[PDB]
Amino acid sequence: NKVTLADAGFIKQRDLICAQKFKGLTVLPPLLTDEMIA
């Protein structure tokens, strides 16, 4: 709760900072989720 993530590679549905997807910048989610790192 002290590291604020930006995108985390999740699916996108007043405009947020994630409007870089429309210009071709897509963030991929990691293979190992946090439930597996835990």
Binding site: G9, F10, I11, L28, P29, P30, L31, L32, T33, E35, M36
Partner: protein, 47 residues
């Protein structure tokens, strides 16, 4: 209406990395063979 002109109609599974079209989602847990993302993996196993 779509730039990719091929057609793929099969079992649909929704992951947090995207939609997986072409693979069945079993309930077992095996070693990761082909990584996809967001936890799940893919493999070529018999039944």
């Amino acid at each position: 209406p779509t730039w990719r002109v091929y057609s793929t109609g099969s079992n649909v599974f929704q992951t947090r990395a995207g939609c997986l079209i072409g693979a069945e989602y079993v309930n077992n847990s095996y070693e990761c063979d082909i990584p996809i993302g967001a936890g799940i993996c893919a493999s070529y196993q018999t039944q």
